[PDB]
Write a protein that binds this ligand. Structure first.
Ligand SMILES: Nc1ncnc2c1ncn2[C@@H]1O[C@H](COP(=O)(O)OP(=O)(O)OP(=O)(O)O)[C@@H](O)[C@H]1O
Ligand SMILES: Nc1ncnc2c1ncn2[C@@H]1O[C@H](COP(=O)(O)OP(=O)(O)OP(=O)(O)O)[C@@H](O)[C@H]1O
Ligand SMILES: Nc1ncnc2c1ncn2[C@@H]1O[C@H](COP(=O)(O)OP(=O)(O)O)[C@@H](O)[C@H]1O
Ligand SMILES: [Mg+2]
Ligand SMILES: [Mg+2]
Ligand SMILES: [Mg+2]
Lengths: 311, 337, 325
């Protein structure tokens, strides 16, 4: 098409369409000598055109030491504001990866996300974007959490002004919000005071459950697209993405497993499982934490958290 | 009935290709189901849901003021079926509601069958005398129908209903407007309710249903290890009865048995509780309890019977006392609590 | 910068036609004439117009503005001081609240009390709105509502007389029984298809009536617990309904009240009462309340909440309605 890359004219494009060449892959997956016999175009121009197209539309590798040095001063560790979870997570969670929190109703995923958002907004003074899909975000709880870390009203207001709230109730709204955030961050490369560092999706299950069922396959494609968006946001822009998920029990085995299926089981790079302590001894706040999946620690270690003491 | 709507020809062709018949058929499915069937996109599927939902009903605004004021347009909210006794009617604030299942539970010899017969007789009176000017349907499950007591009650009716003039009583054909059915199984009861009752109700030959002992087959066919099929059958039966009662504006009276209490259900200090569990209790509107105290009639000499209101959306929990004689069931004045 | 076609709500046929043609990114079709697009792809011009309209269809609020809005919007009082105290002030707007309990425990009384209370004038600390009641069981009796409204009117009159102001008298001039009864809109759904249809029609109704501040659906378990053997379809429908209700509550600044039923869970030869409709339904609501009898008193337990702490209080039902002590 005209304007896609230099050296392409509409006459050449139409002539190529005459001989069944339509897209970039079609032009690249061809032969120089074989194609330049049905119409007889310029011989050495085709290779230059294909080299240019490959230059624009192909990724390039990087030597190991270069990105080692780059990530040495780029990757950051953000504390969650809870000592036990920080010790379990090895001093916090790294940017550039996706973190998942699973658990049943009342487990405390929203509380953990709120504590993280407050700590990042106040302790580190960086922007946070909150995506809510089930109405679990309240400003009163955020104010209560902040009041336990500072007593200056102006400081609290400044911390609260650094948290952005977005409501998305179906999959398409969430995808649009994520794409808009990607575009905004891409346009906001030069700026450094205002760029979002942490993104929280309150519940990915609430927007994918209605699409799953029957003999169809659209829901799987949509959730894979959502996973691709989250991975791109986490890796390319060097951000920290935290999502929450529901818990399910296997009918044939009676084992607790994350929801959304085996295809979703491969998405997160780190998973944390919350639980109640056998009822007794967990009348409130006392919750059971575990490391269901990780890439830097052995799996199975357990810790202890108390929601009541965070406020 | 799908062609009465206003849709684009492509949408109509697609839904016809999907073998969709009626508006209920399309509202039965979900969004993803219609997406997989019609091979459409979300906006036009949403528009189809818009059109179907508007077709089922719409453009009508109903307020509580209209329900409270327009009495003739809404007989359900203002009309009650009398029990034949002023005291019992005062206890029930008019009588039985015209929409919803009413339970009557109690131990043996409490007097439930007498109340059922009295209601079957009283349903035939004119509007100003508490009746609905229609007959009744009686379904027997445990024993045979007591025709001798019914004959005695019909003979004694002019002496019980003192308010009604005798001339109007003389023209009432009591026995010809009561229908009797017999059931020996759960499946037989379900088939009877599904087939024979709606035919009688639609033609207008009856405006009252008496299932009588609903617990009799369930107590004998399902054990403690088959609770799920029993719950399924109970839910189906309750749904069918509620649908019929709502459609034809006719009360449904069910008679239940009790079991030893031996309290999540609010039956702490009571000896007996209604049977069939919570699944059956979830389907009811008004719950009553008839009781007899054999340890107090040993002192009084005469039987001591009380009727109690366990629960109702509009009635406080209260009770009264009644007696049974040759006329029928009659309440005792000045005993309501 | 690149947006894929899969993320847009298009029909599978036109999407697969575009994919087979060679279009991969959203911006690729932003510079193609609809006539030429129809010629190359093979779709009709109406399809091209529709997809071009759809593709060009996909603000900034901070926690401070959200806190200000939360403070400005009030709560709905239940005339039970303990319940209001443990709820944070009352039933919060823009949230979904669920009530569970055994038969004859007082869910419908709470629904009627909330429907009456949503209309209290702001001079007395109310919201001054209107209510929508959706009945799926036929348990809505007008006489009980009349009793509750009369009791509320008497209470407000006594408060105004004690205060001896001037604004209170003007506010109570228009707080009569007729207006209270006329500001409640009633719907009756006899099947789950009818319930879905009414819920679908709700947004336009709320657009027409902008003063509504409460939506009550008295009974969601009954339509879904009979003559429905395909449980996957039931779960899909329930999830869709929950998403629609939370979207409605957030968009129209309402309070959504749902009533559930209780079932029996049999384990270790022991019977416990649990809310019905499965485990995945527990995530649907935002706040969950459970009513039960202890010995003869009625208890309300804040089973789940994202802002408060689990507690338990005492209430009772009077001839005047939902009360305390
Ligand atoms: N201020 C508070 N003080 C103490 N505990 C609190 C406070 N606020 C909330 N909680 C606790 O939070 C619990 C619920 O946690 P949370 O809202 O994070 O659940 P969740 O896992 O997100 O649930 P859902 O699946 O329903 O969205 C409650 O059981 C309550 O005990
Ligand atoms: N002609 C009559 N005169 C007076 N009392 C009578 C007469 N016929 C029956 N009774 C009374 O009816 C009582 C039993 O009533 P009924 O047959 O309605 O019981 P029920 O509650 O249906 O019991 P069950 O569980 O056995 O069906 C007896 O105690 C008896 O005193
Ligand atoms: N007019 C009234 N006066 C006093 N108490 C009443 C009145 N109407 C109903 N009640 C009581 O309130 C309760 C209503 O419970 P209900 O709303 O039916 O709960 P559910 O809908 O969960 O069964 C009943 O137990 C009844 O005893
Ligand atoms: Mg939550
Ligand atoms: Mg009998
Ligand atoms: Mg009710």
């Amino acid at each position: 098409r005209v304007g896609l890359c230099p050296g392409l004219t509409e006459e050449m494009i139409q002539l190529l369409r005459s001989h069944r060449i339509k897209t970039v892959v079609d032009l690249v997956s061809a032969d120089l000598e074989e194609v330049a016999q049905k119409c007889g175009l310029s011989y050495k121009a085709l290779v230059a055109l294909r080299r240019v197209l490959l230059a624009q539309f192909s990724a390039f590798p990087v030597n190991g030491a270069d990105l080692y040095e780059e990530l040495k001063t780029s990757t950051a560790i953000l504390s969650t504001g809870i000592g036990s979870l920080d010790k379990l997570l090895d001093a916090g969670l790294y940017t550039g990866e996706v973190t998942e929190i699973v658990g049943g109703p009342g487990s405390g995923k929203t509380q953990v996300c709120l504590c993280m958002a407050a700590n990042v907004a106040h302790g580190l003074q960086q922007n946070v974007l909150y995506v809510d899909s089930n109405g679990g975000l309240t400003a009163s709880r955020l104010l209560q959490l902040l009041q336990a870390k500072t007593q200056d009203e102006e400081e609290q207001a400044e911390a609260l002004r650094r948290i952005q709230v977005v409501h998305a109730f179906d999959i398409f709204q969430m995808l649009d919000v994520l794409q808009e955030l990607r575009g905004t961050v891409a346009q906001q490369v030069t700026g450094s005071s205002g760029t979002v560092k942490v993104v929280v999706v309150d519940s990915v299950t609430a927007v994918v459950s209605p699409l799953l069922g029957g003999q169809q396959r659209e829901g799987l494609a949509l959730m894979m697209q959502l996973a691709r968006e989250l991975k791109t946001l986490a890796r390319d822009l060097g951000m920290a993405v935290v999502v929450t998920n529901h818990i399910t029990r296997d009918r044939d085995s009676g084992r607790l497993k994350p929801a959304l299926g085996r295809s979703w089981s491969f998405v997160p790079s780190t998973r944390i499982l919350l639980d109640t302590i056998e009822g007794a001894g967990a009348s409130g706040g006392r919750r059971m934490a575990c490391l269901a999946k990780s890439s830097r620690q052995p799996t199975g270690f357990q810790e202890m958290v108390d929601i009541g003491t965070w406020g | 009935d799908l062609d009465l709507l206003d849709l684009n020809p492509r949408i109509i062709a697609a839904i016809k290709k999907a073998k969709l018949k009626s508006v209920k058929e399309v509202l039965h499915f979900s969004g993803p189901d219609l997406k997989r069937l019609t091979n459409l996109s979300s906006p036009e599927v949403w528009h189809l849901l818009r059109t179907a939902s508007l077709h089922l009903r719409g453009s009508s605004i109903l307020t509580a003021l209209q329900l409270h004021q327009q009495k003739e347009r809404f007989p359900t909210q203002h009309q009650r079926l009398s029990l034949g006794c002023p005291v019992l009617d005062a206890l029930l604030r008019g009588g039985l509601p015209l929409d919803g299942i009413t339970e009557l539970a109690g131990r043996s010899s409490a007097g439930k069958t007498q109340l059922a017969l009295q209601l079957c007789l009283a349903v035939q009176f004119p509007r100003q005398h508490g009746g609905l000017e229609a007959g009744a349907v009686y379904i027997c499950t445990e024993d045979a129908f007591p025709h001798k007591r019914l004959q005695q009650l019909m003979a004694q009716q002019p002496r019980l209903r003192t308010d009604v003039p005798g001339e109007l009583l003389q023209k009432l054909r009591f026995g010809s407007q009561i229908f009797i059915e017999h059931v020996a199984d759960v499946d037989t009861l379900l088939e009877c309710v599904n087939k024979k009752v709606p035919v009688l109700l639609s033609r207008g030959m009856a405006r009252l249903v008496v299932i009588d002992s609903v617990a009799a087959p369930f107590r004998c066919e399902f054990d403690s290890q088959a609770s799920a099929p029993r719950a399924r059958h109970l839910q189906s039966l309750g749904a069918t009865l509620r649908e019929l009662s709502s459609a034809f504006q006719s009360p449904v009276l069910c008679i239940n048995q009790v079991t030893e209490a031996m309290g999540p259900l609010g039956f702490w200090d009571e000896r007996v509780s209604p049977a069939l569990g919570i699944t059956w209790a979830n389907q009811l509107l008004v719950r009553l309890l008839a009781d007899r105290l054999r340890e107090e009639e040993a002192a009084l000499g005469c039987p001591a019977r009380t009727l109690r209101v366990l629960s109702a959306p509009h009635l406080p929990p209260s009770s009264c006392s009644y007696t049974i004689s040759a006329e029928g069931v009659r309440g005792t004045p000045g005993t309501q609590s | 910068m690149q947006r894929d076609l899969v993320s847009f709500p298009l029909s599978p046929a036109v999407r697969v036609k575009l994919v087979s043609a060679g279009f991969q990114t959203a911006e690729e079709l932003l510079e193609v004439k609809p006539s030429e697009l129809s010629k190359e792809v093979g779709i009709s011009k109406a399809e091209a117009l529709e997809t071009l309209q759809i593709i060009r269809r996909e603000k900034k609020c901070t926690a401070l503005e959200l806190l200000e809005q939360e403070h400005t919007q009030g709560f709905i009082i239940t005339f039970c001081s303990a319940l209001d105290d443990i709820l944070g002030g009352g039933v919060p707007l823009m949230k979904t609240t669920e009530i569970c309990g055994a038969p004859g425990v007082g869910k419908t009384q709470l629904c009627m009390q909330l429907a009456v209370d949503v209309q209290i004038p702001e001079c007395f600390g109310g919201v001054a709105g209107e209510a929508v009641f959706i009945d799926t069981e036929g348990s809505f009796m007008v006489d009980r509502v009349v009793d509750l409204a009369t009791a509320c009117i008497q209470h407000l009159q006594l408060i105004a007389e004690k205060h001896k102001g001037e604004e209170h008298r003007k506010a109570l001039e228009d707080f009569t029984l007729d207006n209270i009864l006329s500001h409640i809109y009633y719907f009756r759904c006899r099947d789950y298809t009818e319930l879905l249809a009414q819920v679908y029609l709700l947004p336009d109704f709320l657009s027409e009536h902008s003063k509504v501040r409460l939506v009550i659906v008295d009974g969601i378990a009954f339509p879904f617990r009979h003559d429905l053997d395909d449980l996957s379809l039931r779960t899909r429908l329930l999830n869709g309904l929950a998403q629609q209700m939370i979207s409605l509550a957030n968009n129209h600044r309402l309070a959504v009240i749902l009533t559930n039923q209780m079932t029996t869970k049999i384990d270790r030869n022991q019977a416990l009462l649990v809310p019905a409709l499965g485990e995945s339904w527990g995530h649907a609501a935002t706040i969950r309340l459970i009513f039960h009898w202890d010995r003869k008193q009625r208890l309300a337990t804040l089973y789940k909440s994202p802002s408060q702490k689990e507690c338990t209080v005492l209430f009772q039902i009077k001839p005047q309605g939902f009360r305390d002590t």
